[PDB]
């Protein structure tokens, strides 16, 4: 099956890659199988946007 | 889910405290998390994102976002997250505002005050 | 000729002089001396600039050990610690260049008056007095690899 | 001689075309303070022939390999970034001085300065031979040479994995 | 095999600047003229394709000639910017003027003109 979910997870690098998300390949991973477990995924797109502008505040 | 939410917090820090920043920011993410829960097809969405594809050109690329939905099904709450978030003349004026922005960022240096941009003199 | 021109313009051709000599290029008149470096500076010049000549100096040739510490511990026989110092020693070096470059484009307006100039360099007469005593305090005894590590943790 | 008419040409000697002229760049007056941060300069022109002259005379021949090809072919990449470099510095041409190059210039006299003892330490070197040594040079430790060399490797070693992926043959 | 002639009373600090671009003009007044008489029948189903095939590309490199006059009204575009903006095609156009120098030097047609491209960014 691991063989499976490498596919399914490598076509959607590239749907999210020509949207111009700023979603690299480890936050992806990290948010599929984030949202996998249930959580809604209008919320997902409030902490993404506030991690980044916390991040900028620093630099 | 307690530790798929600590593995993100990671990813999307810079790397370089790293160790109070990601305690403060697991906070961010909690508590922006049940801001939307204390507050439709999925295949359709994407169509209204193909049309505005092919409007200002690109057509085949538009013509391939659709090629992939269609093996996707043979997760669809997936896919509903990701929606949330001449060709001389370009090149042309590619390598000319590197030019105004190579000479800009380094002559701002170069004349100034005395000590301005050194960062060993703001010791 | 300095000799034939006044006190208050002749100085404006020694500030412009002097600041290529921080650099590592010799100079008009205040030239460099075959090799710890000597300099020469004018035997017919006003004695109220001479003794103020003597306290900029000690910035080049602090800085004439510095830049060729790097040119030479870079040579692999040497160890991979006694590179990465070297390497950091050169980020330094980059901005002590910046700080001569804005020094020139300021002394095109004049702005820049002799007096003035020994109290800008002020940060970099220490930073390059440190550096340049760590360079000849690494080769004096040769060290490489811990023996350089443990020297960086004995020694703003 | 003007200092202007001096940074005219030194945009020049940094490709090789020559009052500068062509081991040193020996200039011929001018102010002692002058030649001297020119000769500096000039020398660093001198460095990329050097550089040139090896992806220009075996790009020439056809029995170099197929190794030898992809190091002067990543040879080239990290030259058209030095023909940016010289796009911007001559376009404030038109203000920069001599103290002022010294600041802009520094780092490429490094690059140019692996690379122009890279292309000699690999002289007679084809095939996997040369991918084994331009690997002796990641054992230096310098952050910013062991990790430039670290990235030539990882095209000039592309060839190799591609025939393992798939040693001395005899026809 | 184009020989060209600049300047007697010229800077020399042009003209060896100018003979740097040229060798993208005289290794393309040599492809022009192997479409213009490769394409005749009398030459086979091969060599024709080979033809057809070098013309695109022909054609992308007259766009980045039109793109670089449409750049230099605004002045953007300095002698020492030119010799950084062509150099793509300073690669391409001296692939296509040595296959189309070696399948005329021995007279190829057929397989043999598909044998060429297969020894030979």
Redesign the interface.
């Known amino acids: 099956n691991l063989n499976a979910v490498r596919e399914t997870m490598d076509v959607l690098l590239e749907i999210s890659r020509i949207l111009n998300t700023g979603l690299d390949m480890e936050t992806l991973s990290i948010c599929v199988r984030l949202c996998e477990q249930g959580i809604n995924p209008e919320a997902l797109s409030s902490v993404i946007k506030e991690l980044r502008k916390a991040t900028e505040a620093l630099k | 889910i307690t530790q798929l939410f600590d593995d993100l917090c990671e990813a999307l820090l810079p790397a370089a405290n790293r160790k109070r920043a990601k305690r403060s920011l697991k906070k961010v993410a909690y508590n922006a998390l049940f801001t939307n829960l204390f507050q439709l097809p999925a295949r359709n969405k994407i169509l209204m994102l193909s049309f505005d594809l092919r409007v200002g050109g690109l057509g085949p690329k538009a013509d391939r976002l659709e090629e992939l939905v269609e093996e996707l099904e043979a997760v669809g709450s997936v896919l509903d997250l990701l929606v949330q978030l001449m060709d001389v003349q370009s090149l042309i004026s590619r390598e000319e505002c590197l030019c105004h922005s190579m000479i800009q960022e380094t002559l701002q240096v170069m004349e100034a005050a005395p000590g301005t941009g050194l960062p060993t003199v703001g010791l | 000729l300095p000799g034939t021109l006044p006190l208050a313009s002749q100085e404006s051709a020694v500030v412009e002089?002097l600041?290529?000599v921080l650099?590592?290029?010799?100079?008009?008149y205040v030239?460099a001396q075959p090799l710890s470096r000597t300099f020469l500076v004018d035997p017919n010049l006003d004695l109220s600039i001479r003794e103020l000549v003597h306290r900029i100096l000690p910035v080049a040739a602090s800085y004439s050990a510095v830049t060729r510490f790097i040119e030479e511990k870079?040579s692999?026989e040497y160890?991979?610690?006694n590179?990465?110092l070297?390497?950091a020693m050169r980020t330094?070096?980059?901005?002590?260049?910046?700080?001569?470059?804005?020094?020139?484009?300021?002394h095109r307006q004049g702005l820049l008056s002799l007096q003035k100039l020994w109290f800008?360099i002020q940060?970099?007469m220490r930073?390059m007095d440190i550096l340049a005593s760590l360079a000849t305090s690494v080769d004096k005894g040769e060290c490489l690899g811990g023996s350089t590590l443990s020297l960086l943790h004995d020694r703003? | 001689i003007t200092e202007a008419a001096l940074v005219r040409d030194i945009l020049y000697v940094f490709q090789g075309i020559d009052n500068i002229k062509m081991n040193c760049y020996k200039v011929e007056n001018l102010s002692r303070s002058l030649r001297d941060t020119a000769v500096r300069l000039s020398e660093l022109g001198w460095l990329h022939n050097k550089i040139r002259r090896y992806t220009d005379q075996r790009s020439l021949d056809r029995s170099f390999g197929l190794v030898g090809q992809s190091f002067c072919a990543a040879l080239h990449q990290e030259l058209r970034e030095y023909y940016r470099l010289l796009s911007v510095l001559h376009s404030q041409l038109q203000s920069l001085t001599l103290r002022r190059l010294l600041v802009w210039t520094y780092d490429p006299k490094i690059r140019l300065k692996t690379l122009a003892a890279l292309v000699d330490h690999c002289q007679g070197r084809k095939g996997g031979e040369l991918a084994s040594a331009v690997h002796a040079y990641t054992k230096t430790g310098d952050p910013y040479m062991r990790s430039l060399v670290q990235h030539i490797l990882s095209l000039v070693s592309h060839p190799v994995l591609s025939f393992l992926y798939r040693v001395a043959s005899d026809p």
């Open positions: 002089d600041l290529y650099v590592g290029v010799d100079g008009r030239s870079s692999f160890g991979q610690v590179h990465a070297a390497a330094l070096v980059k901005e002590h260049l910046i700080l001569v470059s804005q020094l020139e484009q300021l800008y940060p970099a930073t703003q």
